[PDB]
């Protein structure tokens, strides 16, 4: 599939660079014809067929196809796609309140009520994705953005679908590996992957929201990955002594090695607490 090949600068003016990962660049921009503001994500193309740098065309096209299908308040909207010799440029909805990662760094830890206000929105977005058989495969605080960080109950959107896949045969078995602290054991073990992997990541996120600490994090990537595979975590009393038993129950039912025994997204919404790359 080919994208718009006019110069993006003919249609948008860019401004501030926003925070991003090592591989893409994200800039605020403004569309000349409407004055509306967006975020432009520049994905570097592969320079040759057997190259390791840049993103393969197949991978870019998968991300664009998934973005085009999704429309939900808790997921980022794709507006347009441009391309040139070096980059594919996604014009995305602007989310200006920063990363949940940076919000958490300011608060240290969240109360159970504050955590559930965020978690409900994450679960609603993941329920939409899983209903479409889309696994995100990279859920973590850096991939969740706040619309406005200055309100008492900030609203959020899931971003960056660069690892997302449609799961139409129940599982995928290929080159899929996210960030070590957040990946499920089946990722660590290079096993077939399905929607269950996202549920594990939600368990990790929930643990971090309540404690400010990462449940499997070791001093090196290999230690973290070994900890994930062994389900080596505990609810440290220093962080969790005053946390409700139901919150611990929720996490415990997500941080389960066997994907078939892990809570699904539908289970998570009915749970009584809620119901109203890899190489150093
Ligand atoms: C504003 C921004 C964005 C946007 C789009 N794509 N990726 C984005 N980042 C967010 C930061 N980031 C990391 C990852 C690792 N370490 C530090 C930061 C993860 C990816 C932001 C979209 C709309 N409005």
From Swiss-Prot:
Calcium/calmodulin-dependent serine/threonine kinase involved in multiple cellular signaling pathways that trigger cell survival, apoptosis, and autophagy. Regulates both type I apoptotic and type II autophagic cell deaths signal, depending on the cellular setting. The former is caspase-dependent, while the latter is caspase-independent and is characterized by the accumulation of autophagic vesicles. Phosphorylates PIN1 resulting in inhibition of its catalytic activity, nuclear localization, and cellular function. Phosphorylates TPM1, enhancing stress fiber formation in endothelial cells. Induction: Up-regulated following treatment with IFNG/IFN-gamma. Signal peptide: none annotated. Interacts with KLHL20. Interacts (via death domain) with MAPK1 and MAPK3. Interacts with MAP1B (via N-terminus). Interacts with PRKD1 in an oxidative stress-regulated manner. Interacts with PIN1, PDCD6, BECN1, TSC2 and STX1A. Interacts (via kinase domain) with DAPK3 (via kinase domain). Interacts with GRINB. Interacts (via death domain) with UNC5B (via death domain). Interacts with UNC5C (via death domain). Belongs to the protein kinase superfamily. CAMK Ser/Thr protein kinase family. DAP kinase subfamily. ATP binds at residues 18-26, 41, 93-95, 99, 160. The active site is at 138 (proton acceptor). Isoform 2 is expressed in normal intestinal tissue as well as in colorectal carcinomas. Residues 12-274 form the Protein kinase domain. The autoinhibitory domain sterically blocks the substrate peptide-binding site by making both hydrophobic and electrostatic contacts with the kinase core. This is Death-associated protein kinase 1. The gene is DAPK1. Ubiquitinated by the BCR(KLHL20) E3 ubiquitin ligase complex, leading to its degradation by the proteasome. Removal of the C-terminal tail of isoform 2 (corresponding to amino acids 296-337 of isoform 2) by proteolytic cleavage stimulates maximally its membrane-blebbing function.
